[PDB]
Amino acid sequence: VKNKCVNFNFNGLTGTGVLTKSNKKFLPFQQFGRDIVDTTDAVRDPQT
Amino acid sequence: LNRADYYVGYLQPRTFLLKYNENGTITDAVDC
């Protein structure tokens, strides 16, 4: 649901927020992902 | 077989500060 605030349980990682398209150059090994304060900010949908 | 290499080094437990580039890539690192 890329644009509506949602409770997510992505691979055990529970939390709440919104999901939008991202161009993060996640080289093909980068997964959970985070930010400057090291807080999960970008999860590559494992299925897609 | 059929018919100038072997560069070996040993790593150590050290603290490093790594400079990341905008595309997620490591441009420079400094050994504290």
């Binding site: 090994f29 997964q31 | 560069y7 080094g9 490093f16 990341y20």
Partner: peptide, 24 residues
């Protein structure tokens, strides 16, 4: 056979410690 000459490594041998994207 082989030789065992020494060589400075300079700034070399740095790998991504984990798989987390980081920018700036």
């Amino acid at each position: 056979t082989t030789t065992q000459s020494y060589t400075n490594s300079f700034t070399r041998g740095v790998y991504y410690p984990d798989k987390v994207f980081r920018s700036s």
